[PDB]
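Reviewers asked in the last cycle whether our approach scales beyond single polypeptides. To address this, we selected a multi-component target totalling 956 residues and predicted its structure end to end. The input consisted of the following lines:
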Amino acid sequence: SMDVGVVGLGVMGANLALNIAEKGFKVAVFNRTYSKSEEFMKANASAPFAGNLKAFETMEAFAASLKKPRKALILVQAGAATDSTIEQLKKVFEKGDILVDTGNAHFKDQGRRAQQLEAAGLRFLGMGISGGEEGARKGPAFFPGGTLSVWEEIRPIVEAAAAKADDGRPCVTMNGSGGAGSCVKMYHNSGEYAILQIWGEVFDILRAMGLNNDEVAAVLEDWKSKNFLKSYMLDISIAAARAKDKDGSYLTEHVMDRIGSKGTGLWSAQEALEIGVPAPSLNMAVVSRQFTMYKTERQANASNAPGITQSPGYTLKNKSPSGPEIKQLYDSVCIAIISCYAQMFQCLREMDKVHNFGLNLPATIATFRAGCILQGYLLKPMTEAFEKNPNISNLMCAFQTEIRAGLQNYRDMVALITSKLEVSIPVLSASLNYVTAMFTPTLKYGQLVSLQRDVFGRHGYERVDKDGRESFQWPELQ
Amino acid sequence: SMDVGVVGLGVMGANLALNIAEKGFKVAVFNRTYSKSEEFMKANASAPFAGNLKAFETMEAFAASLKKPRKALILVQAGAATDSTIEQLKKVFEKGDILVDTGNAHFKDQGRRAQQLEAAGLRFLGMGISGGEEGARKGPAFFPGGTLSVWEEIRPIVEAAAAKADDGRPCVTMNGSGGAGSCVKMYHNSGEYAILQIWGEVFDILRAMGLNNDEVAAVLEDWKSKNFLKSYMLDISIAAARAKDKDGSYLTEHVMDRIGSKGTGLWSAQEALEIGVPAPSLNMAVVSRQFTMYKTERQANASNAPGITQSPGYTLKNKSPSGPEIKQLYDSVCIAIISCYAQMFQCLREMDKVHNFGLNLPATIATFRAGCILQGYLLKPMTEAFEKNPNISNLMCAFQTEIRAGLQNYRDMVALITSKLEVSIPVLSASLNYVTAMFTPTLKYGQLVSLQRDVFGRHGYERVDKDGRESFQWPELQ
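The resulting structure, written as structure tokens, was:
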């Protein structure tokens, strides 16, 4: 009798299964195209734990092997296929069993699937998984939401396969009801986008300033040694920059500049907008990708107006990590990244208030420390900040010191990049605005726009001295 | 019999009624609280066209008086209010009649309504209207869409009431089917958001640079005479700036910095994101308002980190429009505004192909020339530009000259404001990135990010030299 069943042998599904197999649990496996199951069993025939790997043919056979209550991690990356798979399962399953969708769809869909199901007798759980291929095999992070009782049943299996933080804690924790887990995964992917784009801009900026791919890597490597930015994403950027083609040249130069995406980012942007929390970096991260996808249009515009974007340029006198400007960039990045995290958490906090998940923010953040793509040093003090005072106005307050120290440098660096370089910095730019705007008591432009709306729409405006709305009597303008 | 009916007497309802009856048509009126109709016919009983106005009892009556096919213009608040009203009408009308919704619905709802109604034997028309209270009376712009059949039946009343642009052409045209008209209005409101914000930013910047409310007015005033920026919104900004409170001080100083919104801008942002078209200025326009609504949080953040946004500052030598700095700020705005319109139009271009509206852009953009909020000089050359080459890659090229000339000024100003001023410039900033990004053939950050996605997710990447997708082999990182 199998302890758990894993549905869908993808990048994640197969690695995850192994991980759980190696942890000692007997796992029934199942794929759409049985053939793949074969190839799978093949490449892993020799593993020392291949005895815990039972492959199957028919759902109905697969379902009987699992110890009641069955437990099935649906690892089929889809939207539709996930619903299709849920139907197959739902039929061959019995009252009480569990269906865990580790899927990657809108938290709103999870609220649906769950609700139908409980009324149909089966128990559901929407759970996120971050770590990628390696993370899946070695130990990712999970972000569950759903029935409180369902968690306790599954806890042993996931706590064992989760990555362990520097404090022995497994990076998994019940985040709250319904789609709470899928929401956290969504916003996680949201911050991921903003951060990857930040590194990407750094690359573009340094290249513009005269550094070649190797010299860039040395500054990333220096920044890694300074510790504050130590992160997975930083590591992969270094790999990405040093990478070389078969012909011995930098890979990056042969890469078509069009960034694909699969939606998590897009939705987080739309919901942030929906509920109304300001998250400029999260949006511009998606917009920045949209920029690339329009390769054809950009090429046409260029032809129509040759070198219109031309600037004076700025070639670096000191291409070494200790150079004055490179230190200016460093601070920029540190703050920029901090604001990305800030916005990400503010969205989550607000999302809890609105959907009432009963989210335990400091418990959730703690599970970001390893396995997931967002892992890195900064997660330590951020976890502590939210542990120390859970009702903090905003995450940036906790870093008031760091921020004061580099804010001017942040301002100078983008001022210089803007006037002198021929590079677009969507995210680095939006992030600075987030910082300046969020620490400003009175935004004057809000006074003007507020009045304007009254001029044509007669919407009225709030006053700082009275109460209620006031509407001004305006002269005709046509 | 009656020429046409109007339901709902908001700021828009009443005025449009008078607009229409003044033009020679008999207009049946209805409303929920018959009191409101009483108050309407009340205040307007002396008008030389009152005999072309008739307040009604019930829909039985209202629908009774109208020349068949009944044509009704619903003018109530969007949402459930509209839904109800259409249902009441539905009972009291007959095969062939026409329901013209004109109250700001998300273009997807209109397309649905169209079908509902079309399967029930009635005709529907989603028809946006813009111009505000004054414009509603003097003649605004209309953005209709749905069945062509209805259009030619309504063309007289809407043409006669709409504003006429220079060439004497009225600001109305059939925009396409279904929700094509509401879509145009949605994006019209989206450009409006961005541009209002740009003026608001100008106010903030000059105030920061030392100008008092009356001195900025003089700058705008000079900008108007330069003609290129002549626009409605410019005019109202001037009024807004000049306005004084009963205590004889500037109104803006007593205004609560919180910008309300009603959705159209929000959705335009979400759909632009959805179809994937890059509209950074349209997106940040909504965010900038979000920034203001978080007044409480901003106030708290400021208390926990006093003087954190403290900057060098920059006071101007001459507060006269002849000031060199004021001159570059001018180029900045010109260019900023041009990209706003550009983004707006690209959104519609793609919207049309995805949703197959059969929209004729040059006809559509021509109806924006007068009556609507976005009206101004620029709409003239822009209209020409699209009549000249309908499949021009991006409107920005048609303005290559002006861009080439002011681009560095635009960069230097933004650089200056970023470095020295204690103000946030969300949209002036995003718009500059839109310009630099859209004219750049190769965005290098796209190369890094592209590869990054491969590292962890094994998503592969497109090559500029091979064709298809490739995936590299990477070192373990954990």
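The radius of gyration of chain B is 25 Å. We regard this as preliminary and will revisit it once experimental data from Aim 1 are available.
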